[PDB]
């Protein structure tokens, strides 16, 4: 299997596992269309279990993507509209700051300061309603970006109400099963327990806790073959039969909103092909992609472009994940790890890798 394609992922993560202490790792290079794997390491350092192309790791915020698809599809299937007020599908919120924010500004993070996290004490639906009905917002709507799991967790259980299927039951048939995501999952079954790494925080084995608005904002878990599947979909999205699901491929990929030099999708972030390194790698480091940053609107977004560096980093407590992809050049790649490690090593690692290739 081509040998520069070995070389070039072999050189590159080999000193960033070296370099990170990073315990297991599996690594997806889709080239041309087609996927290349590569693993190393420990699903389960006391058990010795070896990483494999059916071991389960948590994509923290890489789930993102999926709940993008996911309302994508909603607006393909007319179940909802991005342009519609968050308060039509959740009429319990009725204070007065939720004029004008919608379902768009849920998606995107630019609500006006929604909170990276919901708070820990949210646990009921009832705790749910009176978070967001006494937040306060920073900012007007739609005038700045602040990443957070409380915007887009929300906007993925609203962008479902209409179907009536809970967020995972629409997951599952509307996105996983159509792609034949086969080994992804929002609550990893019994039977995929023996394949489910371990996390390592500390040296300490660790899993996600249950959150609030988990599901929807960083609950799935998934092996690099399901992975490399969804990069190539999301490569190739006229490939996919169903209609709806592919239109929203290219609406989670639409251009809503620009900050610096990167662009705001749905789940995804997608920057302009050929990219400036130093600006994907230095901009990852979650001292800027945190961050309160002032947005410019496009109006109208700009459908899903080809050469675009399309990206999206995600982390656990105990993981951390990273895709990236050019459909310009049907080249992408998936880093999935069971340890929590710098963005900018993520993304510095995946630019030389493909550069190299491209
Ligand atoms: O172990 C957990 O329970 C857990 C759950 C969700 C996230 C994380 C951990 C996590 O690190 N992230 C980050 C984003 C993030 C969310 C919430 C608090 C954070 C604090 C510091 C850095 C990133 C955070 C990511 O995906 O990159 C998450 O979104």
Not at 29 to 42: D, E, L, N
Not at 202 to 215: I, M, T
């Amino acid at each position: 299997a081509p040998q520069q394609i070995n070389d070039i992922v072999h050189r590159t993560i080999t000193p960033l596992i070296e370099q990170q202490k990073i315990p297991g790792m599996a690594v997806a290079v889709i080239y041309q269309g087609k996927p290349y794997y590569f693993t190393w390491g420990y699903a389960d350092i006391a058990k010795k279990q070896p990483v494999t192309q059916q071991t389960l790791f948590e994509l923290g915020s890489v789930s993102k993507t999926f709940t993008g698809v996911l309302g994508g599809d909603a607006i393909a299937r007319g179940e909802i509209k991005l342009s519609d007020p968050t308060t039509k599908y959740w009429p319990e919120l009725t204070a007065k700051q939720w004029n004008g924010i919608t379902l768009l500004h849920l998606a995107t993070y630019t609500a006006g300061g929604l909170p990276l996290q919901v708070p820990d004490e949210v646990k009921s639906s009832s705790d749910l309603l009176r978070f967001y009905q006494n937040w306060q917002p920073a900012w007007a709507p739609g005038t700045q970006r602040l990443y957070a799991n409380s915007s887009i967790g929300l906007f993925g259980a609203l962008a479902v109400k209409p179907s009536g299927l809970s967020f995972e039951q629409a997951m599952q048939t509307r996105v996983f099963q159509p792609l034949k995501l086969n080994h992804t999952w929002i609550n990893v079954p019994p039977a995929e327990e023996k394949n489910y790494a371990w996390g390592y925080r500390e040296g300490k084995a660790v899993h996600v806790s249950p959150g609030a608005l988990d599901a929807e904002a960083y609950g799935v878990k998934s092996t690099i073959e399901d992975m490399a599947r969804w990069v190539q979909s999301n490569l190739k999205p006229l490939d996919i039969n169903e209609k709806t699901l592919q239109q929203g491929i290219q609406l989670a990929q639409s251009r809503y909103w620009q900050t610096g030099d990167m662009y705001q999708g749905l789940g995804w972030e997608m920057l302009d092909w050929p990219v400036n390194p130093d600006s994907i790698i230095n901009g990852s480091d979650n001292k800027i992609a945190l961050a309160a940053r002032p947005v410019k609107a496009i109006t109208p977004p700009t459908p899903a472009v080809r050469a675009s560096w399309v990206h999206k980093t995600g982390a656990t407590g105990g993981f951390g994940s990273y895709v990236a992809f050019i459909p310009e050049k049907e080249l992408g790649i998936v880093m999935l790890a069971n340890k929590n490690y710098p963005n900018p090593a993520r993304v510095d690692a995946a630019w030389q890798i493909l550069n190299a290739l491209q």
